[PDB]
Amino acid sequence: TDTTPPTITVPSDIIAYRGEEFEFYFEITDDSGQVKNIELSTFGKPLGLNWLEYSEDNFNVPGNATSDNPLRVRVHGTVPLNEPIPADKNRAQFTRTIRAWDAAGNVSSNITFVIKYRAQTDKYNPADPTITYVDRLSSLSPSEKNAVEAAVRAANPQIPAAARITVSANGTVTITYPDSSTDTITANRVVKDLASSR
Amino acid sequence: TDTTPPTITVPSDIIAYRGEEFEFYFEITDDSGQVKNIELSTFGKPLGLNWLEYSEDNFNVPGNATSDNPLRVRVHGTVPLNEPIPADKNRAQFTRTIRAWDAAGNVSSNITFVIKYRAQTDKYNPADPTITYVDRLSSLSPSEKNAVEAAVRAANPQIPAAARITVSANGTVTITYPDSSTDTITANRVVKDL
Ligand SMILES: CO[C@@H]1O[C@H](CO)[C@H](O)[C@H](O[C@]2(C(=O)O)C[C@H](O)[C@@H](NC(=O)CO)[C@H]([C@H](O)[C@H](O)CO)O2)[C@H]1O
Ligand SMILES: [Ca+2]
Ligand SMILES: [Ca+2]
Ligand SMILES: [Ca+2]
Ligand SMILES: [Ca+2]
Ligand SMILES: [Ca+2]
Ligand SMILES: [Ca+2]
Ligand SMILES: [Ca+2]
Ligand code: NA
Q1: Which of B20, B136, B143 to mutate to test the interface with A (most CBs of A within 10 A)?
Q2: N or C, which end of chain B is more exposed by having fewer CB within 10 Å?
């Protein structure tokens, strides 16, 4: 008789960026070769993360969970754009637990996984734009600000389209990601005097 | 015999906007059907408008200035982008004179014309953008601002490409034209609660 519960393999470095879809996989096997279902929890309490999702595809099918072909459970979601990140950046995580049943009613003991989440600017590193030559460095014209925003946008296609690029009177660039975290580019790397570069 | 000066017809409403090229036409006619040349001046003195230019095409040719086909002098230019604008718009203008003469040497009197100039916002009237909903009216997100600018821009292709559209925390829209004059769109015609 089967008295042995399923065995679960967890990903070791799950990192998510606010507002951006992420995914990761659990791998599960059982000596019977069949896994019935799983439970995501907070150590036996409600999961408490309605944005976390996973497919029950191929659950409880003979052969779905062998050593050669493990049950691969795809977990995905989006950490909310405005999920709180406290002063200590490393507190930004959720520790949760997973267990699985086999077809014989053996349930594994909860093991932990940790979902770390960070601000979008941690993901993004803006390349400097091609220099925009201006008439007065301490007072850019509207067309000069537009050229800057265009140049920055052009130099960083990997940056999200929903990120907003602003430009100050002296050409300082602020890039504000959808989660309101920011990057900055100093004026002396964005604009130069036209008449001097003659 | 020709002892009669040519007749000059000036445009009644010449209105230019800073930084933007304008054009207008004088129409000139003479008995003889020929106009020799014209002169633009400040009531006889130098014109003092180096940014103004006019075409001397077909001057002093027989039949260039008849009542059926008058001499049409094309005038064009650009009023300087930073031309000072008096609080009293009545002084926001250049008053000048034109005279013309025929091949007989009959010179017309100095006829007045006036080039009024204005800030770029006097020309542009932005249409309302497609309404954009936001999660919080008093505090728009980066994405919601991006969509606002895009919506304003979309509904106003007439605005110069060089103009800059900014959006504030509450969705108030500011359009700043190349001459640094501005238009404003209030949040009521821009944003709403989702
Ligand atoms: C209830 O006690 C929990 O015990 C767990 C044992 O591993 C954890 O220590 C847990 O702490 C964290 C976590 O999930 O790891 C620590 C995080 O810094 C904290 N996150 C934040 O404050 C912001 O993301 C989380 C959350 O408070 C919690 O997971 C949400 O339910 O708790 C202990 O809370
Ligand atoms: Ca088993
Ligand atoms: Ca960054
Ligand atoms: Ca913009
Ligand atoms: Ca005549
Ligand atoms: Ca020519
Ligand atoms: Ca206007
Ligand atoms: Ca007007
Ligand atoms: Na003609």
Answers
A1: B143
A2: N
